[PDB]
Symmetry: C3
Subunit: 138 residues, 3 copies
């Protein structure tokens, strides 16, 4: 078909926009808030999906940050690796290969973001990558 | 169509289950043994596909671990990055971004797992990621 | 449908071959110059897409290497992580998880390759991964 619009919404009401295509057993979904642009002929600007502490569940264990979501779609996605910047409370930051999924618990979608140990508590995780999940249904 | 079930089997007879969708030139395949769950409202549990030494070919060169497989499907997949835990024989372990493919040699499928140098011989590689390959046929 | 052939071409006229499948809103595209082979029953050979300095725009900022392309297709792809080897001018080299995209500026396709800091100027980036992008159109 053609690409349908949609979004999820976080605890703090941040809106995660996306375009999808549901085919037979197949759901493909791209998050569209941070598509990066060449601003001019020589510079590439990454954009971020900024997720703060208050969008994650507490406690956090095993550098696993869970983002309970609302609305949107209910998928058990594969895992995709992405570019993360992780901001510590002291404003230190660390660029990492993070690993994201969509999963469902109690019929609610959640984003699973896993990354590496950091020397502090995290203030914010920025996702600098354009994310697309190809999911299988049923 | 709807998602068909399938599996590969290793030298040591470990069974690698998967769901797929074959469309025209297109084969999409997700491994389903290690789909991770929120066990309760706050904890996310990763599962592993555990591959021991005896599932790989010898000799091993360039931190490339080849897993000759049986049955299943014959695809030259793209490369997907995943979360690996690599267990050394002294039970030390290292978390890495590993890179997997499906390829075919002498009409047999093989899994290609590449990762980083470690200070020892490897006892086991665990794949903590949900793997899905989108492959092109012909 | 069945997988169509195609290519892009760089500033220095290097040819980037690929196979694709355009469905309704969906373009899937695999680069085919570096599909890796088991050369014999025990050895896996990676191949590279070798990109030299003269294929990138200048100046380079934020370890972001832009490869302006010609012909081929015009897609705003998601970001895919890949295996990079980065060769310095002193022939030192660094293996990295790099992150690639296809994007369009002034109606021209460009490849966006991002990677980590290195202690020197880069002579060449080799992409050791088989790249496939699943893109959404419109
Ligand atoms: C990945 C996965 O299987 N998720 C499932 C979870 C967990 O499996 C439970 O913890 C097992 O009881 O269970 C559900 O029934 C749920 O609560 O929404 C369906 C959901 O898709
Ligand atoms: C990635 C790839 O091309 N794999 C192919 C290999 C190698 O190319 C050979 O080493 C070249 O002789 O060859 C086959 O004929 C084979 O033995 O199964 C088909 C297989 O798909
Ligand atoms: C990712 C993205 O949006 N790229 C678009 C760019 C930039 O957005 C411009 O810098 C905004 O003016 O604009 C176009 O009009 C262009 O020049 O080709 C279309 C292109 O797809």
């Amino acid at each position: 078909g053609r690409a349908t619009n949609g979004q999820f919404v976080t605890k703090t009401a941040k809106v995660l926009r996306y375009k999808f295509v549901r085919w037979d057993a197949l759901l493909i979904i791209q998050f569209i808030d941070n598509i990066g642009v060449m601003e001019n002929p020589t510079f590439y600007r990454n954009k971020s999906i900024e997720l703060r502490s208050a969008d994650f569940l507490s406690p956090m264990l095993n550098n696993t940050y869970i983002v309970p979501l609302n609305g949107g779609v209910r998928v058990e996605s594969p895992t995709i690796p992405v570019q993360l910047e992780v901001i510590l409370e002291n404003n230190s930051s660390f660029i990492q290969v993070g690993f994201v999924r969509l999963t469902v618990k109690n019929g609610n979608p959640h984003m699973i973001i896993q990354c590496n140990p950091v020397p502090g508590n995290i203030k914010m995780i920025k996702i600098k990558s354009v994310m697309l999940f190809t999911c299988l249904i049923g």
